[PDB]
């Protein structure tokens, strides 16, 4: 079973917003943070309630050695939507993104459209002074800002008070881009023959005091108390491996725009001159960076979203645009920093007697959020009758991009690959 008693969080759950060292400074940040004094649910164990996930979750736990392994994320937690899994097995982790089926207790039996996994050093550290009284308190913070699942942690012992209220910062451990939809949240247990602290983050403005050593000593909220609000107001590397752009441009089944195959590029040397050779460029509209000055810049990560679309939709693809593709199929974010590449390909998307392999979505319940995929076949509703049967007033969502060797250029196949560069203060992986 379990219990759902409520307690107070006090001044707890503040993590270094960036990776920028600061000294004798009173830097003010706006991001997701756990509100000061803000209602954290303390649970027990002796079944395992699936907790809602929104705007990140603050998770703390006090245990003897180990009874909590990891966490599960995703939506509907079934074999119809991709899901996460972060079990800290033994002295390592097991992070992965896969459409997990079920276990109802080997935590999954899914080996389908999965892979896309990330392993790393274990997130569980325990030390004892020859005695078990050293009940170290493990605090974690997770968030899913436009994917890029972020994870923060900090282990601190000498827990003489239930949920110490003293200040404690949180250091990041790993930042892997899952790029999925997360709404639910669940936790794993262990075996044997008082923990589960859970708080939710909300968008707040924090004012943080930084020590000369960079350690965050004190922080004050700016939306909690009149005094707090007033106080707030007054306050290239050793790489030679050429990037796989070759395959990116030498693929044969650049997917349809309804499933934009995103390709992450890292640990490589990006000489775009090869990118200039596998494509008589018809459109090289770069927004965040000048294409001439691309060989003197270092990007922490590069994303190569590849999809073939029609001619007008090439002009459609741009930051802040409109159309049946820019709303329901692929929406580039407004502050895009990257390049779009669209050369012609009427030799691989054509044949006599025709071809209709490709696809696109004219019918979605809402607009597509920036960099989000929506692969699903649901009949669009009309009137007040939910169909899923197909016909008038009952429409299938995606209609075909049937390509043939003889259309006008406005209808001719256009191979589009869009590069999303990362120009932000962080370890440079691509140069
Ligand atoms: C910031 O860094 C200083 C230089 O390392 C710290 O001073 C030291 O403190 C350690 C023990 O904490 C001593 O062993 C050493 O001799 C020296 O005095 C200083 O404490 C630290 N300030 C912090 C962590 O707030
Ligand atoms: O090896 C890499 O760098 C990348 O690892 C993972 C990425 O998945 S992605 O969904 O993210 O693109 C792949 O594209 C590749
Ligand atoms: C906060 O916790 C108190 C004590 O259990 C409870 O009465 C109150 O309703 C909680 N507020 C919210 C919004 O959860
Ligand atoms: C946990 O599972 C991962 C799966 O890749 C494995 O690499 C790791 O070695 C395991 N943990 C251990 C044995 O410490
Ligand atoms: C994987 O997804 C494709 C469509 O994207 C679907 O046809 C296929 O059945 C899926 N496989 C599984 C079971 O994950
Ligand atoms: C994440 O989950 C919801 C429900 O599954 C889904 O509609 C959407 O992709 C995400 N949330 C919203 C409303 O943006
Ligand atoms: C490259 O190797 C040299 C020699 O070992 C080392 O000093 C340097 O720090 C390395 N650079 C990077 C970015 O790893
Ligand atoms: C792909 O094939 C070879 C490399 O295998 C290359 O010469 C050719 O230009 C490539 N074609 C395109 C369109 O990228």
Residue numbers in the entry: 23 to 68, 80 to 138, 158 to 210, 212 to 246, 263 to 304, 329 to 482, 484 to 525
From the paper:
The dense glycan shield consisting of 22–23 N-glycosylation sequons per protomer is an essential feature of SARS-CoV-2 S architecture. The glycans have been shown to play intrinsic and extrinsic roles in protein folding, modulating conformational activation and immune evasion. The transition to the ‘up’ state exposures of RBD for the binding to hACE2 is also a prerequisite for S-mediated viral fusion, directly correlating with infectivity. Here, we dissected the role of N354-linked glycosylation, acquired by BA.2.86 sub-lineages, as a RBD conformational control element in attenuating viral infectivity.
To understand SARS-CoV-2 engagement of the HS cofactor and how the N354 glycan alters HS usage at the molecular level, we determined cryo-EM structures of XBB.1.5, BA.2.86, JN.1, and BA.2.86-T356K in complex with HS at 3.2–3.8 Å. Interestingly, incubation with HS led to marked conformational alteration, yielding substantially increased ‘RBD-up’ state in the N354 glycosylated S-trimers, but had limited impact in RBD conformation modulation for S-trimers without the N354 glycosylation. Due to structural heterogeneity and flexibility of HS, only the density for part of the HS basic unit, IdoA (2S) (2-O-sulfo-α-L-iduronic acid), is clear, allowing identification of the location of major binding sites and interactions. In contrast to binding of sialoglycan to the domain A (corresponding to the NTD in SARS-CoVs) in HKU1 and MERS-CoV, HS mainly targets a semi-open, shallow, elongated cavity composed of a number of positively charged residues on RBD, downstream within a deep groove, named the N354 pocket, constructed by the residues N354, R355, K/T356, and R357 from RBD and T157 and F168 from neighboring NTD, is occupied by the HS fragment. The HS fragment is poised to possibly interact with R355 and R357 through hydrogen bonds and a salt bridge, meanwhile residues K356, N354, R346, and R466 might contribute to further coordinate the oligosaccharide. Notably, the absence of the N354 glycan in the immediate vicinity of the binding groove probably facilitates unobstructed engagement of HS, in line with the observed affinity; however, the presence of the N354 glycan together with the bound HS widens the binding groove by 3 Å, pushing the neighboring NTD outwards and thereby conferring a relatively relaxed upper arrangement. Strikingly, all the N354 glycosylated SC2-VLPs exhibited a dose-dependent enhanced infectivity upon HS treatment, reaching up to the infectivity level for their parental variants and loss of the N354 glycosylation largely eliminated the HS-induced enhanced infectivity in BA.2.86, indicative of differential usage of HS as a cofactor for modulating infectivity of the N354 glycosylated variants in furin/hACE2 enriched microenvironments.
